[PDB]
């Protein structure tokens, strides 16, 4: 009998209630207040050009059909109650296959205040498209967007607003970063309008600004390529008659860059253009391949024009170390600053 | 209040198992489509991913209502209450609607009975590719849909004036293909259970060789050019002229399998396989030439001296001749 008071209230609210009609139909526009709490900003996939994010997706709106009076002012009900009332049909525009969690129960809450205000949050795993231009790979930055809005209601029926100031309406958890090769430099929260053949819709937008971390590539690609280039230039000091000695340096250095370039390509992103990684590998291969040509040129001129052959080695000991120094100065100053 | 009365009157006695005009005339359905993005073309499995906003319109005289309200703008809670055409995608491999946060469906009803029904779908459609000229040919991946149980005497489809609309073409995930255009046609397919009206959309794709140049063409050419260095090395440097003659052959073997990583296990020979196979001939021929020089060292000592000079001219000329034939025939079919 003590809890039958609250049972009678719930049966009264739903007595004659119609969940096919939005609140204030024919009277006003349904305003929905939205905020997002990012529990964890998941991994970013370059091959799929998508990112994962786990959020608490809170929405709030007023429905005068659900006013009540009783011993309590807020009814913290089960998520079962949500399916019997009207809820916004918010969908993510750029969202790919997403997950609503169901363990051990549907991860949803519903709270009704005495004036009819509703709060309705849910836990989701959102996968969204993040178009990427990898011309500066691996020194590139991206602004991954998150867009959501109504699917069936135009902006003359349902509008979306942020619960607080737009800057504070999306909060990222302190320990939620699950990024392995990116840094979340910040975020931008905005709003807009999208027009279709069925009308105009309100779309809420949040951009996450990410910058790739270059540490992995310096270990795996840049340093092995630089050391191989420096190794290939040792042959310019050995005398012209040390054919067995210069053979081991020429063949191994040329083979190492061939191995590195093929090995690197497997993990490199699949694009139709050339990234900043490709130009470094291509140029580093030119220096290694030119050194072998220099060995073959000097060896060809040995025993016929020894003075000419010795002249080539004097210049290669200077030009090759200098030119590779100049290229690195231009390369790193071009991409790091931008 | 009044909208509730209209909705409750429409469904009173309504039977959703019976299509409109079940014994009078075929139901005419006007279909639209907005392509959000054509995903990457998986040539290995011969399929592609496409995300669309599929729209359908038809009349239903059981859904007429007289009032001052002109359109009933409704959510997805009513889709299962009325009759819905059973449209399916014939060449689909895997498709599913979108259910976050609610079903991405829309139902609008006009007072003359007209129904607009729209939903968001993601489709992995089958696309068979003829790779004899890969990667320098044009393809047209189709997308077919029709009713499943209703023959041409019960349901007829028809494209609208502005049927297929695309957004930003260049923002799509295609990287080894470039979108060209789209065509929509209509035919009739006769199955064992009747004749059905089948609607098709074709997406034309060009070559876009940018990706395969970095992976195969440039690496193979560099190895072949590397192989020519053996012709300016003294013949007494046997380890030098042999390591270049056995390492490049091994590397060219590795690149041969890499070229086929992006292709299905097809029986025939693609254009890219022809390039790699010919390149493997040149690097192997250079190894043979060095051996041929030693065989003639004592038999015809004067001939062996001029053999290296002939190598320095024949191999660069033959490879340039081959590229002239290769890149003119394929690129200007």
């Amino acid at each position: 009998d003590n809890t039958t008071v609250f049972t009678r209230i719930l049966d009264r609210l739903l007595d004659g209630y119609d969940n096919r009609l939005r609140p204030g139909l024919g009277e006003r526009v349904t305003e929905v207040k939205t905020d997002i709490f990012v529990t964890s900003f998941g991994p970013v996939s370059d091959h799929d050009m998508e990112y994962t994010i786990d959020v608490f997706f809170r929405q709030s709106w007023k429905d005068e059909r659900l006013k009540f009076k009783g011993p309590m002012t807020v009814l913290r009900l089960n998520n079962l109650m949500a399916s019997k009332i009207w809820t916004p049909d918010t969908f993510f525009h750029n969202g790919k296959k997403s997950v609503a969690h169901n363990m051990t129960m549907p991860n949803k809450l519903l709270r009704i205040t005495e004036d009819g205000t509703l709060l309705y949050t849910m836990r989701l795993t959102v996968r969204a498209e993040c178009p990427m231009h990898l011309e500066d790979f691996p020194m590139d930055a991206h602004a991954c967007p998150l867009k959501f809005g109504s699917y069936a209601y135009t902006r003359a029926e349902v509008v979306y607003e942020w619960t607080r100031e737009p800057a504070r309406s999306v909060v990222v958890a302190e320990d939620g970063s699950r990024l392995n090769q990116y840094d979340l430099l910040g975020q931008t929260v905005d709003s807009g309008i999208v027009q279709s053949s069925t009308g105009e819709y309100v779309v809420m937008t949040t951009h996450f600004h990410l910058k790739r971390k270059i540490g992995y590539f310096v270990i795996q690609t840049y340093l092995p390529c630089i050391m191989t280039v420096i190794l290939s230039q040792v042959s310019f000091w050995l005398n012209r008659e040390s054919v067995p000695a210069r053979t081991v340096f020429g063949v191994t250095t040329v083979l190492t860059m061939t191995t590195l370039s093929i090995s690197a390509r497997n993990s490199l992103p699949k694009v139709a253009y050339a990234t900043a990684m490709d130009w470094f590998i291509a140029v580093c291969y030119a220096f290694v391949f030119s050194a072998l040509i220099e060995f073959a040129t000097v060896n060809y001129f040995t025993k016929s024009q020894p003075a000419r052959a010795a002249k080539i080695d004097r210049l290669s000991r200077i030009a090759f170390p200098l030119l590779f120094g100049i290229f690195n100065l231009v390369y790193w100053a071009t991409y790091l600053n931008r | 209040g009044d909208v509730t009365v209209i909705l409750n009157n429409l469904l009173e006695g309504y039977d959703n198992k019976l299509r409109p005009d079940i014994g009078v005339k075929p139901t005419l359905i006007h279909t639209d489509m907005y392509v959000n993005s054509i995903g990457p073309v998986n040539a290995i499995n011969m399929e592609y991913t496409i995300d669309i906003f599929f729209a359908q319109t038809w009349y239903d005289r059981r859904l007429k209502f007289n009032s001052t309200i002109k359109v009933l703008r409704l959510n997805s809670n009513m889709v299962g209450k009325i009759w819905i055409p059973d449209t399916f995608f014939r060449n689909s491999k895997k498709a599913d609607a979108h259910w976050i946060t609610t079903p991405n469906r829309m139902l609008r009803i006009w007072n003359d009975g007209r129904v607009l029904y729209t939903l968001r779908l993601t489709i992995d459609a089958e696309c068979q590719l003829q790779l004899h000229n890969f990667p320098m040919d044009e393809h047209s991946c189709p997308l077919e849909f029709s009713s499943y149980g209703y023959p041409r005497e019960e349901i007829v489809y028809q494209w609208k004036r502005s049927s297929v609309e695309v957004g930003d073409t260049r923002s799509w995930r295609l990287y080894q293909f470039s979108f060209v255009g789209l065509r929509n046609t209509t035919e009739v397919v006769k199955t064992t259970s009747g004749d059905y009206v089948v609607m098709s959309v074709y997406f034309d794709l060009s070559r876009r060789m940018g990706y395969f140049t970095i992976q195969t063409y440039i690496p193979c050419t560099l190895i072949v050019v590397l192989s020519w260095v053996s012709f300016w090395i003294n013949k007494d440097a046997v380890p030098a002229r042999t390591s270049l003659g056995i390492t490049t052959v091994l590397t060219m073997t590795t690149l041969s399998t890499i070229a086929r990583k992006s292709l299905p296990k097809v029986s025939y020979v693609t254009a890219m396989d022809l390039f790699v196979s010919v390149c493997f001939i040149f690097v192997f021929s250079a190894l043979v030439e060095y051996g041929t020089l030693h065989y003639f060292v004592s038999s015809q000592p004067a001939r062996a001296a001029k053999m290296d000079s002939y190598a320095r001219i024949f191999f660069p000329t033959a490879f340039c001749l081959f590229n002239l034939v290769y890149w003119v025939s394929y690129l200007y079919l």
Partner: nanobody, 123 residues
Framework: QVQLQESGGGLVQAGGSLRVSCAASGRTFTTYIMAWFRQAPGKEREFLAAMDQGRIQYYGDSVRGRFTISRDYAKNSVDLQLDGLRPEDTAVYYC?????????????????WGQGTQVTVSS
């Protein structure tokens, strides 16, 4: 050299409609965010409107609900519509493109800037 050639603009009297158009060449910029900026003489540069690859319209507070922005992705062109022109609207209008990093309402986020079209309102 990448050039965002502009046209349209001009001079109008006592208000009225005006269409300012923009075009891009060299590399397809549909993958970028194209926006319109207004710089009053000597005051500062002001954001007006933007549209991204997803066909999403963002508007500034002063020109909210008055101006219309649309893009033609086939021709890689962005057109801005000016309606109800006022004497305070006399300024120079620029065409910008970029990736929208650190916000699409910031001028510094657009790498490419147009030449600029002069628009004068007489009243």
């Amino acid at each position: 050299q990448v050039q965002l050639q502009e046209s349209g603009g001009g001079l109008v009297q006592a208000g009225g409609s005006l269409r300012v158009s923009c075009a891009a060449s060299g590399r397809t910029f549909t993958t970028y965010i194209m926006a319109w900026f207004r710089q009053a003489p000597g005051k500062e540069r002001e954001f007006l409107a933007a549209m991204d690859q997803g066909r999403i319209q963002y508007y500034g507070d002063s020109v909210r609900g008055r101006f219309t922005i649309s893009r033609d992705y086939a021709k890689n062109s962005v057109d801005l519509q000016l309606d109800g022109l006022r004497p305070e609207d006399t300024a120079v209008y620029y065409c910008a493109a970029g990736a929208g990093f650190w916000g699409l309402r910031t001028a510094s986020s657009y790498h490419y800037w147009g030449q600029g079209t002069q628009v004068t309102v007489s009243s």
